[PDB]
Swiss-Prot record, chains A, B:
Transmembrane segments: none annotated. The gene is MYH11. This is Myosin-11. The rodlike tail sequence is highly repetitive, showing cycles of a 28-residue repeat pattern composed of 4 heptapeptides, characteristic for alpha-helical coiled coils. Limited proteolysis of myosin heavy chain produces 1 light meromyosin (LMM) and 1 heavy meromyosin (HMM). HMM can be further cleaved into 2 globular subfragments (S1) and 1 rod-shaped subfragment (S2). Muscle myosin is a hexameric protein that consists of 2 heavy chain subunits (MHC), 2 alkali light chain subunits (MLC) and 2 regulatory light chain subunits (MLC-2). It comes from Gallus gallus. It is found in: Cytoplasm, Myofibril.
């Protein structure tokens, strides 16, 4: 049980680390962007 | 190894608390900037 919990928490730690690096890379150069007209295409492909 | 695993679990608890608080601080840092932060904060979950 303890080793299963250890695997789960280390995976969660890796997820938190990647989230933190993404988040503190967010703040620099986010001013404008393009439209999401093709984003819904990915959503409908996922739906089908 | 039980003592080692209990120490590891306590360290994981402290680490996750610290990670949560610093992530909350980082998120609260940005309040006036662009709203595309949540766009990619959902995109990450999209690929996941």
């Amino acid at each position: 049980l303890e080793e299963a919990l250890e695997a789960k928490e280390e995976l969660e730690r890796t997820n938190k680390m990647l989230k933190a690096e993404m988040e503190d890379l967010v703040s620099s150069k986010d001013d404008v962007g393009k439209n999401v007209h093709e984003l819904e295409k990915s959503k409908r492909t996922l739906e089908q």
